[PDB]
Design a protein around this nucleic acid. Sequence first.
RNA 1: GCGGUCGCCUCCUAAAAGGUAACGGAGGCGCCCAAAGGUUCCCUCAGAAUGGUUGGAAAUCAUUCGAAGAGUGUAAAGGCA
RNA 2: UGGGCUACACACGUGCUACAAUGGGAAGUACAACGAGUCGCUAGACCGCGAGGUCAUGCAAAUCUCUUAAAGCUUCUCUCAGUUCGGAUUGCAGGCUGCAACUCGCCUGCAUGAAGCCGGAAUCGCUAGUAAUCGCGGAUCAGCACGCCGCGGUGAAUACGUUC
RNA 3: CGCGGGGUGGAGCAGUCAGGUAGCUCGUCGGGCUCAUAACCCGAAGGUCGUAGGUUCAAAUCCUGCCCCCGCAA
Lengths: 176, 81, 114, 55
Amino acid sequence: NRLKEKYIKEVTPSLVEKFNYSSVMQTPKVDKIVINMGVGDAVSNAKNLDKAVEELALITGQKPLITKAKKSIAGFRLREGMPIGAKVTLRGERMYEFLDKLVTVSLPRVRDFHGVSKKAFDGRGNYTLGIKEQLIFPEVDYDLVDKVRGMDIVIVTTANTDEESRELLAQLGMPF
Amino acid sequence: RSLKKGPFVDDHLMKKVEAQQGAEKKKVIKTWSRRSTIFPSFVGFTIAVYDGRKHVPVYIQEDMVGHKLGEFAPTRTYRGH
Amino acid sequence: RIAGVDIPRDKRVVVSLTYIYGIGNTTAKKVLANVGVSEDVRVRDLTNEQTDAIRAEIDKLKVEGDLRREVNLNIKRLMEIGSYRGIRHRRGLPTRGQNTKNNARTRKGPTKTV
Amino acid sequence: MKQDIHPNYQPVVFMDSTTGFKFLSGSTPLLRVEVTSDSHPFYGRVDRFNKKYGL
RNA sequence: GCGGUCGCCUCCUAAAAGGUAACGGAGGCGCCCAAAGGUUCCCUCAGAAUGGUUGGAAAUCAUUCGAAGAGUGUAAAGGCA
RNA sequence: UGGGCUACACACGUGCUACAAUGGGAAGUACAACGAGUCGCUAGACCGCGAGGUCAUGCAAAUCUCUUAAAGCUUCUCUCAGUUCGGAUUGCAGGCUGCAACUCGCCUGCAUGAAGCCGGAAUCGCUAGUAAUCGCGGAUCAGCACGCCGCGGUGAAUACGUUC
RNA sequence: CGCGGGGUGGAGCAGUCAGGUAGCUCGUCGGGCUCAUAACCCGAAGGUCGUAGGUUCAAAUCCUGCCCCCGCAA
Ligand SMILES: [K+]
Ligand SMILES: [Mg+2]
Ligand SMILES: [Mg+2]
Ligand SMILES: [Mg+2]
Ligand SMILES: [Mg+2]
Ligand SMILES: [Mg+2]
Ligand SMILES: [Mg+2]
């Protein structure tokens, strides 16, 4: 909850003094953080998909939702209704804890982390990160990391804009 | 030289390069010396080395210093069968 | 275990450390001598302090990942500048001035009788 | 939060002994951590030729 | 005479009720479902743009655009957000 | 002068290393012969993990050196494994030669550690100090041969017999 | 435009009915035997079965089309 207390005390004055909001309820606020892991190879054998479910659980303390196709694609031998990977939706104190864990542990633990892209926005105030390589904190349990697949890590906000989101994540800790 | 002594290089080549002190790239130099080394002074020139049949050019950069000139002017135009 | 490899247990210390990508018999004996233990014990009979000292000196030394990165960056350098010695790699040929006529199967790979 | 499906998610401490930084957060009490924001920095052949042969 | 057709369903022909023929034009059926029924409760699609790892033109994730451009077991018509 | 005879989809011959425990590795220790040597063989000492380098002595030689040969023997360890086998290939550092070692040299060290678990059709050598295996020297040679020539160490089995 | 019969390694053919995961013979290539060639011997290469899709756990095979060949007609 250190991150939430920061968001309340340090960020919001430091944010409003710049952005000139006539009310605190214009504040950019992190509404959720979504994790996704697409697999595809699960169509070959979904035991790796069970493994991805396992790792999302180990990472978050939160069982994931298995996603499924709304279509069939002969190019990948893909059938509608079959499990393409998994996702998670963190909200609240768990979400803040996860983000703080990222910034304070597992962004440095990438082999060559000198920063991240600044342009990775949607043009509407929501950020999209991607782990190319797993095994970024100790409780990833390296003894059983069969494969590195990666993650999409969406960070949704009430931010109107790229600028609001960027400054928010700056004060929160994201090393752009 | 693999003996911890003078890194080998030809006197005339050294002479002409050191005369080329302003480091203009238009001052392109030729040689039949495939056996000489490369130095930091060479880094940035377009030298033309005799490969047995032609003066093949090559532009030097930082990643050539410990190497010879003949390594960048091969002599065998193999193209498969 | 040590640097990302679950080494054997019935083996002795030196010969089990040989299974690290970067440590042979000589450097293994040097490391065990710098640490000051017996070279003829089996790793399933170690004190974890000895294991930790071993891990410390190994991390001081250049090993699996750094070693791969170093050798591969060397190869990529000499390939990208365009030297003969890198054209050999890019073409799949031997590199130390060998004869590529009646031999060189360890780079050619499988034979193709044509 | 439903029962019998989620992992045990307990408050644990993360410690960077490189700087002694101490942080609390929930995961699956004290744990070992090597590097972090408070200990990470971002938060040659000519030279080598010269070293080998002095110039 | 051969070919084709003979029973049933849908459209056009069919002339703004219905009906309406031709060896006129186009297609389907001779089943499936034990949930693809019933009821109660809840939800709304397709595609495009943007960004993101393997992951591409395109799988999956997120926001916006999005009035139906989807889906409706199975033909076409009608209809249904 | 530089390049090429050293290429490389491939095929063949002659060799070397192997695919292991009759063995690998560490230590100690024993027994040869032929032959070569002046700007050459080089003792001994020191440095260096090593290849080798500095000093310096003897020898134009049965007087000195190359030269304490290796297999072998006695111990220790490895205990069946693509292994501590195998050593290729490759990266890095060095050493020598020599104006110059990239094409295109030899050696060493470190690291990797491929193929290969005795080999199809077929085919080669050998009857005794032979085969088999073990090393040593020399000619060419500034430097470089798994080849060539010679040297000696250890040391078998078989030959019924001419059907083919 | 239609009706029959065909599209399986280089040639010829089965396997199609009855789905069970591509084969027979010859030929080509390489190495052996031979003074040499043929024969003979030991090896290999060459096709998801004309093609785009469906059905199926699985298709050369069953279904739907599309593209070529031989007969008739045309
Ligand atoms: K010699
Ligand atoms: Mg050679
Ligand atoms: Mg009517
Ligand atoms: Mg020749
Ligand atoms: Mg060995
Ligand atoms: Mg005889
Ligand atoms: Mg033949």
